[PDB]
Amino acid sequence: GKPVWAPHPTDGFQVGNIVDIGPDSLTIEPLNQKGKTFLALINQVFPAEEDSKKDVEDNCSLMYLNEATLLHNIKVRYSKDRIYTYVANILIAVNPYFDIPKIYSSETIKSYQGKSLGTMPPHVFAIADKAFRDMKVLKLSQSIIVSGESGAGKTENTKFVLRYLTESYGTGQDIDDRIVEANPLLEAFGNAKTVRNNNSSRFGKFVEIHFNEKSSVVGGFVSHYLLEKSRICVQGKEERNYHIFYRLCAGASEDIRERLHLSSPDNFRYLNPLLDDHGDFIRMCTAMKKIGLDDEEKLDLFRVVAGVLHLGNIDFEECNLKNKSTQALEYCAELLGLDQDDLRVSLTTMVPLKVEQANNARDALAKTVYSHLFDHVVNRVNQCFPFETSSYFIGVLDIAGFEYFEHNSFEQFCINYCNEKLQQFFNERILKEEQELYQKEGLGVNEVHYVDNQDCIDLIEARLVGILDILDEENRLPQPSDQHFTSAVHQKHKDHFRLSIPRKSKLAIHRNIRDDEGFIIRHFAGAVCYETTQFVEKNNDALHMSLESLICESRDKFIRELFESSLSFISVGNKFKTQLNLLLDKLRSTGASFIRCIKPNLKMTSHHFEGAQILSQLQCSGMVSVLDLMQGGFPSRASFHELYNMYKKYMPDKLARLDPRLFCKALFKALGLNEIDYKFGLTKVFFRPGKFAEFDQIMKSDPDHLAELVKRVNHWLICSRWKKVQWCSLSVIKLKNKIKYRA
């Protein structure tokens, strides 16, 4: 009995031996723990690579491609600082949590230029290069989809893609600098320190580099999605608000500090080490000057940021403004160009408002102002690299993936809806790539299929009957209620395969939720229990008419211009659906590449591979679905060079003198391998499941018998060598005659 991979609660998988087989489960003996046994379902036990020390650049070079061999392979590579590995064209990127030397240098960028995947070690640069080459050669726009949990490295790898593209195929002009300075500038306003990531993206983005007919850079475009509005006013312990606040408070000059009435972050309600706020303010100002922001615009942005800070310091009491909040109202009115009394009225009027309702009005005005400023910043960045026309683009998508929370609310619902649509796109594209390969390599008929999740997408977004539309209807009711909304969803989708009631859950924590207080969605990656409290409130982006009129009639042009664009109700869900639908329209018109970012542990430490956590990420990123798809045909793929180097030692020297292709041709003829199970493709040998392992066993068998098999095909081999050079001689003469013909 050969050792196998069996489940392990913290490692994901462990090595063991099947000590007993049953109809449903296998009895596993963990390695070197004689007498210890555990049960595992037959579908959770996997074959292992004989060589536990080997590592492959492409997981398709494994004898068994499964979730356990993949996990082990990326683990071996990770311990050697090889954070990049392929699964055919998919790139897996494991966050190292330290600066690996050489691999991001300008000299390494050069070494990747014009090179096909597989001709260089796996890298983010190779994916970026493939998008350029495919765009130029196929005359088709490209997309690079970068997924993963918070802290997995999506923002870093998006940045590596843009530095690679600009240094390699950019103009050499300032537009190159503007493309690379765009996102660090947006990071000041849209990024924040969280428990999971010190530089967490609190918004999704699609970054496009636009090109003309000659594959030359003409501009760029940035689309932003779901800025986290809650963070503006309230943040959990160990968390901060957006970087800009701390950066402005830390680095502003004596002049700016006086004009904006700024002090340390400790003096602001909306505000809460190894984070260089001072130095980051310096880099932000450099980015601002590089993209073309004048000192006036810089100050206008800062005034609004300071205005929001002072608004947060306005406290109330049973209502009226607290005596200590008089200086805060004055500082807020001045910076926002409003009259002190008009603002005072608005923060406590309808007609009178209680302390809590007053806080909500203050917080709603703060959230709306900050959000409008973030929209302005994104649009201002877009104005720094505009274009009238373009032929194609290379777009990088960086958005939060499907993830775990103890409490899933409206924000997780939107993110999980997004990932349900992106996972469908990923499935379609991996299936298309598999079909192309069976045609190109002559692997015959495909007959491979995934489970579509259109029903899950429809449950969420279908017109009239979808959750998003049922939510909007609730917002429009005279007395909106989260319970009435949840009941409407349960009534309308009672028979739905993708919907469940909390009461039915195996988990006591979910069963505690009343039917009208939550629902379970069977997402592609697993069932999620949503608590629907605050759904109706979170679905409204609209600011109350009193507050809106106030800020619209502002003395400052810049503040008026933030609202120049603009029952008070704006659907967050349906705004996102529209944005997501335009994003998919763009993605569907492109050739797509996928990067799967993996967070190795929850402690931001280097060299700490948490097997179960990583295995869970590979499950939630759609990778196991991808491996099932590949298992349906020829999951083992080894080039003639790879097999020649692996197996030449087991053969006579006469065969070792042949080129890899002829060495492989001779081996297949000598072994008499069947063309059903083994396919001799264009540049590689394709093996059906278990066939590469069979072949490896035959190669490692009796040396004298192998030599006899080779002797038996001697005549055929001599004739093959002769014909190769004779037909090559005819090629050269035919090619010489074609040159003569054309003259």
Binding site: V137, R661, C719, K723, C728, S731, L735, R742
Partner: protein, 146 residues
């Protein structure tokens, strides 16, 4: 291409001598290298013009079907045999009507084929039907269509 399945199969093996890294594609670089190796001397203008006919793709690379198209031209009955005779003369360096083991070695190693002097003698012996220890035109042709 509109060639016999067997001719395509033989030319597919010949194409692997151009595609050393294999890879699946070749450029003017590999065309010229191999052509020089077999007594031909095209210019970079000639190679670039020839590749233009079979590359609508524009990336400066060609695959096996594109290579087949590049070799194709309007031909006469006589033209085909003249080519095989010319191919044999590539091997028969001194033009004495026989390919010697020494002549075969020159061709083999010019093409980067690795093999001992014993193995060259072995190839000669296998192609040598009449047993005179060398390969004539009839024997070269019989081997070419084996």
């Amino acid at each position: 291409d509109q060639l016999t399945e067997e001719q395509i199969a033989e030319f597919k093996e010949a194409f692997s001598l151009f595609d050393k890294d294999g890879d699946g594609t070749i450029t003017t670089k590999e065309l010229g290298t191999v052509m020089r190796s077999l007594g031909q001397n095209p210019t970079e203008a000639e190679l670039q013009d020839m590749i233009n006919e079979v590359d609508a793709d524009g990336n400066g690379t060609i695959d096996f079907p594109e290579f087949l198209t590049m070799m194709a031209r309007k031909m006469k009955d006589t033209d085909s045999e003249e080519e095989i005779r010319e191919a044999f003369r590539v091997f028969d360096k001194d033009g004495n009507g026989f390919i010697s083991a020494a002549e075969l070695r020159h061709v083999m190693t010019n093409l980067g084929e690795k093999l001992t002097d014993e193995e060259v003698d072995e190839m000669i012996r296998e192609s040598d039907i009449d047993g005179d220890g060398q390969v004539n035109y009839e024997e070269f042709v019989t081997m070419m269509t084996s």
